[PDB]
Structure formats: C-alpha cells, structure tokens
From a paper:
Prokaryotic adaptive immunity by CRISPR‐Cas systems, which confer resistance to foreign genetic elements, has been used by bacteria to combat viruses. To cope, viruses evolved multiple anti‐CRISPR proteins, which can inhibit system function through various mechanisms. Although the structures and mechanisms of several anti‐CRISPR proteins have been elucidated, those of the AcrIF9 family have not yet been identified.
To understand the molecular basis underlying AcrIF9 anti‐CRISPR function, we determined the 1.2 Å crystal structure of AcrIF9. Structural and biochemical studies showed that AcrIF9 exists in monomeric form in solution and can directly interact with DNA using a positively charged cleft. Based on analysis of the structure, we suggest part of the anti‐CRISPR molecular mechanism by AcrIF9.
Author numbering: 1 to 76
Write the structure that this text describes.
C-alpha cells in the first residue's frame, strides 16, 4: 500500500519550510523520490510524516541520516 510522506527541501538541517505531499510504497522509495525531486544545489532533503516527525534527511554528497522514531522514555 502507498503511504503519505512529506518531502521538504530546506537550506539548513535545522530549518523548517512547507513541504510537498508524496505517496510511496516504502521509506526506501520515498528517499529515492526525495533525491530525485531536489531542485537546488547544497540544500537538505528531509522526509517527514504528515504529523511532522522527522524520518530521515540528506545533505549533498553525504548519506541519508535516519532519525529516531520513538517517543522518549526515562531510562532511570
């Protein structure tokens, strides 16, 4: 089944902008779509859920960085 993702192209890793709605059948496929859709040299592509959770992002010339998906809990 397709899932909804949001792809953002941002100037800086810790920047926020409106993204674009995509559908993809896996996170792997969403990453392929996001890299293909990059419009500007030197920006960061980020994949989020519709609820705004960071899933992964990629700077130019670097590999995808996968982000932590679970809510925090106390370890002590």
């Amino acid at each position: 089944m397709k899932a909804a993702y949001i792809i953002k192209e941002v100037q800086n890793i810790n920047s926020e902008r409106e993204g674009t709605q995509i559908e993809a059948t896996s996170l792997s496929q969403a990453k392929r779509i996001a890299s293909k859709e990059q419009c500007f040299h030197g920006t960061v592509m980020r994949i989020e859920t519709v609820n705004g959770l960071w899933l992964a992002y990629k700077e130019d010339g670097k590999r995808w960085v996968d982000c932590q998906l679970e809510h925090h809990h106390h370890h002590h």
